[PDB]
Amino acid sequence: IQHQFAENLSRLKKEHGLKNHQIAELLNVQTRTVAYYMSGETKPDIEKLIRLATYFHLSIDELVGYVQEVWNDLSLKQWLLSLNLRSEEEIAKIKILVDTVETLYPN
Amino acid sequence: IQHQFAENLSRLKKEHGLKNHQIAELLNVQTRTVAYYMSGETKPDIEKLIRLATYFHLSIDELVGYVQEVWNDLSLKQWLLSLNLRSEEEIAKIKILVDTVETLYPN
Amino acid sequence: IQHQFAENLSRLKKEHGLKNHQIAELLNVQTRTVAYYMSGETKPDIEKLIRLATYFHLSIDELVGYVQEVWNDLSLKQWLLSLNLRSEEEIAKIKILVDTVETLYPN
Amino acid sequence: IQHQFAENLSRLKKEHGLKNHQIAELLNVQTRTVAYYMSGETKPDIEKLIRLATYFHLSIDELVGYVQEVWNDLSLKQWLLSLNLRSEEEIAKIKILVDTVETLYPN
Numbered sequence: 001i002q003h004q005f006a007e008n009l010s011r012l013k014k015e016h017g018l019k020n021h022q023i024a025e026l027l028n029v030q031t032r033t034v035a036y037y038m039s040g041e042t043k044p045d046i047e048k049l050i051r052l053a054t055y056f057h058l059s060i061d062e063l064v065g066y067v068q069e070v071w072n073d074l075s076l077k078q079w080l081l082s083l084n085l086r087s088e089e090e091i092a093k094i095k096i097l098v099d100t101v102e103t104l105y106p107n
Numbered sequence: 108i109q110h111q112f113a114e115n116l117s118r119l120k121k122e123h124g125l126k127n128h129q130i131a132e133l134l135n136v137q138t139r140t141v142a143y144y145m146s147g148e149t150k151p152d153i154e155k156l157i158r159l160a161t162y163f164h165l166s167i168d169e170l171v172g173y174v175q176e177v178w179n180d181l182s183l184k185q186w187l188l189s190l191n192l193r194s195e196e197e198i199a200k201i202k203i204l205v206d207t208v209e210t211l212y213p214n
Numbered sequence: 215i216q217h218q219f220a221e222n223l224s225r226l227k228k229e230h231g232l233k234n235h236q237i238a239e240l241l242n243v244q245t246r247t248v249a250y251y252m253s254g255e256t257k258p259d260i261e262k263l264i265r266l267a268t269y270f271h272l273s274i275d276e277l278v279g280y281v282q283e284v285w286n287d288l289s290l291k292q293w294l295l296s297l298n299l300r301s302e303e304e305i306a307k308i309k310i311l312v313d314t315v316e317t318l319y320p321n
Numbered sequence: 322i323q324h325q326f327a328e329n330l331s332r333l334k335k336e337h338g339l340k341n342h343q344i345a346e347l348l349n350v351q352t353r354t355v356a357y358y359m360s361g362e363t364k365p366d367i368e369k370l371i372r373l374a375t376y377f378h379l380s381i382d383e384l385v386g387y388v389q390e391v392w393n394d395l396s397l398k399q400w401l402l403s404l405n406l407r408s409e410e411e412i413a414k415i416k417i418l419v420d421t422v423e424t425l426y427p428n
């Protein structure tokens with residue numbers, strides 16, 4: 001239930017051989033602020049989590065240690081999953097179609 | 108590259124028939140602050156993103172619209188993936204083993 | 215690179231306390247055939263993998279130990295990901311829209 | 322509930338501008354057999370699904386249109402998720418530790 005951002009950031013720092021001032025430089029904050037991230041005394045805003053997730057190639061969920069725990073109709077989930085087979089050109093067309101219809105006929 | 112939290116929160120509000128004050132009550136903030144979330148004028152901290160993701164049953168990545176874009180050795184990835192087959196009782200034992208060894212013999 | 219279905223099925227059998235004849239009954243095959251699955255001498259067809267994945271609540275990828283290893287434009291991936299926020303009723307409408315247009319105007 | 326491998330393979334063939342004989346060459350089967358895959362008259366074995374998923378960069382689940390639908394204790398799931406933060410060198414060590422202990426002291 002409780003996230004573990006401070007523990008995770010501490011382990012990333014260790015495993016990557018980083019110093020707090022290097023992370024501070026990455027996020028444009030004080031080195032002191034990064035110390036407080038690590039100790040859990042203070043937490044970053046969404047923009048800072050995104051910069052860290054991008055740097056370390058992590059999902060935001062992995063970075064903060066967030067985990068969860070139902071579709072009524074599975075053939076819809078199956079259709080949605082099937083969009084991952086489409087080329088980017090075909091997905092681009094579907095996005096225009098759906099955006100257009102939503103603009104013209106707002107639910 | 109740019110997240111779309113404000114757009115996503117706005118669509119969740121619409122599709123769920125929520126009023127800003129209901130979301131405000133959920134997060135223990137002012138209704139005005141929720142208005143600013145929706146317009147993108149201000150962003151929530153990690154604790155507020157987690158409360159929203161939990162409420163709407165979403166990953167934090169889905170909630171904010173974060174997307175990314177390599178293992179050197181795939182048999183390790185394959186091993187890690189294989190842990191998802193294990194019972195919770197067996198994963199609990201592995202966690203104790205690994206935590207213990209890390210405590211005794213800190214890399 | 216090489217899948218590990220036989221190793222995985224063997225570990226599932228062990229961790230669940232199953233006997234080969236119980237798995238055979240699940241798949242409507244001979245107990246001997248299940249023995250050959252476990253030893254890697256023979257592999258199941260897609261229908262049998264789906265029955266096993268469903269029984270054990272696993273992805274087919276997890277069940278067989280399959281792992282992989284690029285979007286040209288990430289805002290499309292981000293849009294696709296955003297569909298996971300939509301209600302089933304709204305996804306159902308999008309599916310009809312897209313299916314209809316594909317039927318009328320086949321790429 | 323019902324997979325959609327034949328529909329998916331048909332759409333991949335279309336979107337990629339492939340001919341059946343090209344897919345046949347990829348899988349080392351007759352062109353006729355690929356025709357039967359597409360019409361759903363016959364299904365490939367796991368080795369052939371893996372070759373297709375690898376070629377098209379898809380999960381096996383995406384390729385066949387398989388979808389599913391609980392952890393008792395979430396802090397274990399959270400620990401397992403946290404392994405994705407580790408370097409490959411550290412995961413390699415954990416794998417040796419766990420494999421060794423399993424070999425010495427078989428549950």
Ligand SMILES: [Cl-]
Pocket residue numbers: 028029030033
């Ligand atoms: Cl600062």
Ligand SMILES: [Cl-]
Pocket residue numbers: 135136137140
């Ligand atoms: Cl407030």
Ligand SMILES: [Cl-]
Pocket residue numbers: 242243244247
């Ligand atoms: Cl049989």
Ligand SMILES: [Cl-]
Pocket residue numbers: 349350351354
């Ligand atoms: Cl053949």
